[PDB]
Amino acid sequence: HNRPRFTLQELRDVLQERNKLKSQLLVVQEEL
Amino acid sequence: NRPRFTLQELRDVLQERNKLKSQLLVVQEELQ
Amino acid sequence: TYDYLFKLLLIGDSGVGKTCVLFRFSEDAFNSTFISTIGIDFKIRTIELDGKRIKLQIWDTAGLERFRTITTAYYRGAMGIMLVYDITNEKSFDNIRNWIRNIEEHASADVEKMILGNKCDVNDKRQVSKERGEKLALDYGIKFMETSAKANINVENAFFTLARDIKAKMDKK
Amino acid sequence: AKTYDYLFKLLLIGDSGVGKTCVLFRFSEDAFNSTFISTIGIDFKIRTIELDGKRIKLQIWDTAGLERFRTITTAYYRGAMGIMLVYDITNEKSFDNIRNWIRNIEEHASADVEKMILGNKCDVNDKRQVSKERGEKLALDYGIKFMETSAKANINVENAFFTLARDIKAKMDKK
Ligand SMILES: Nc1nc2c(ncn2[C@@H]2O[C@H](COP(=O)(O)OP(=O)(O)OP(=O)(O)O)[C@@H](O)[C@H]2O)c(=O)[nH]1
Ligand SMILES: Nc1nc2c(ncn2[C@@H]2O[C@H](COP(=O)(O)OP(=O)(O)OP(=O)(O)O)[C@@H](O)[C@H]2O)c(=O)[nH]1
Ligand SMILES: [Mg+2]
Ligand SMILES: [Mg+2]
């Protein structure tokens, strides 16, 4: 379905969480 | 405000977020 | 490394306290702010039972209807499910029967289930007496507890009891 | 412990389809995938380079060009230290829209942000619609550096990022 369901705030919050996790992951990955 | 983004758009980011969290927790605990 | 991995799921209406119940279990903390869950999230906690290390992967579902398709995907692999209502919100309690039907349609027929009547610290807004929760759980043949993420009541007990019941079933291999 | 001496925040903006994600994929992973996967909102990639004996970590944010993501993407303009404005040499509209992307920079980025225009897909010259001369003249008019790039053929991708980072560093060092 191409049907709009989720708001700007909802998608933005999950994107922000994803990007913050990617940074945390890259950091601890290079501690090796 | 208004619904704007699709199920697939939100799901894709959610699943990427979940995957990074799992990967982060793994490398974190591997520092024993 | 662990002996067993138990996938748990929290379901119930928006606002009943699923995320705060998980926050109490995994961080021993509570906050009064409402940050509604976008789709699904999870936390991990590893516990020790009978000399076995049990990794609990706990999936925290959004209760709002617009996340229904996202959340039901996670029923299929669940080994235990907490059904949560808000003792100050009789509508959330009446909806437990709909959440049970959702489990019956998508989870294993033998999945471990437990009902939590949460926010039992808010007696000055209570809408569902403890006895009604006990009777609902008895009728389905499942366990019941009143919990408070805020006052730290029965949260540890609920998760450890669910995990022990999953382990006991599994040990009957 | 800190693996760098400077951290530069870079941003890629421009119409959907011009090659921003492919330019970053070529820079950060030295590869090219022709299968188009439109960017959802924003993403970033990392690469560390060496300038004047200093370790420069580049944190490169890749924006979606589609209008439905515009508010999400413009939130990332203010922190950018350098911005690549990307068009597609085979798509005249994407070139025409560079003027509007510059306006978006003026409205939301720091006044002193370093800018560079990239005419991407310069490997596809038999479907070229924007002459290199026209790209150079537009960039000259705005006082912005210009390069034609190809993520596919690996043309000027390292040059573009190295040059933008050197321009950022020189400004930082002189102040
Ligand atoms: N007094 C009291 N408040 C609680 C308790 N548990 C949760 N709350 C509050 O109730 C509100 C909702 O809690 P959440 O855990 O976010 O609700 P949820 O079930 O996760 O809601 P969704 O994510 O939207 O499905 C928040 O303001 C919490 O602080 C509790 O045990 N006692
Ligand atoms: N021939 C050629 N094709 C390219 C080049 N760069 C990108 N492409 C193709 O152009 C299409 C669009 O590329 P993307 O990098 O995904 O475009 P984008 O700017 O990131 O688009 P949005 O994320 O939607 O804003 C892709 O299918 C690529 O295969 C290039 O340098 N040469
Ligand atoms: Mg929640
Ligand atoms: Mg892209």
Numbering used by the authors:
A (entry chain C): 128 to 159
B (entry chain D): 129 to 160
C (entry chain A): 4 to 176
D (entry chain B): 2 to 176
Question: How is this structure described in the published paper?
Answer:
Rab8a is one of several Rab GTPases that are substrates of leucine-rich repeat kinase 2 (LRRK2), a serine/threonine kinase that is linked to Parkinson's disease. Rab8a is phosphorylated at T72 (pT72) in its switch 2 helix and recruits the phospho-specific effector RILPL2, which subsequently regulates ciliogenesis. LRRK2 phosphorylation of Rab8a and Rab10 also promoted interaction with two poorly studied scaffolding proteins termed RILPL1 (Rab interacting lysosomal protein-like 1) and RILPL2 (Steger et al., 2017), that were previously implicated in regulating ciliogenesis.
Here, we describe the crystal structure of T72 phosphorylated Rab8a(GTP) in complex with a minimal phospho-Rab binding domain of RILPL2 at 1.8 Å resolution. For these studies we utilized a mutant of the globular G-domain of Rab8a (Q67L, residues 1–181) that binds GTP constitutively. Full-length RILPL2 complexes failed to crystallize, but the phospho-Rab binding domain of RILPL2 (residues 129–165) yielded crystals in complex with pRab8a. Each pRab8a molecule interacts with both α helices of the effector, burying approximately 625 Å2 of surface area at each interface. The X-cap facilitates interactions of both monomers of RILPL2 with a single phosphorylated switch 2 of pRab8a. The phosphate moiety from pT72 interacts with the guanidino group (NH1/NH2) of R132RL2 on both sides of the symmetric complex, with O/N distances between 2.5 and 2.9 Å. Mutation of K149RL2—which forms a salt bridge with D44R8 (switch 1)—also abolishes the interaction between RILPL2 and pRab8a.
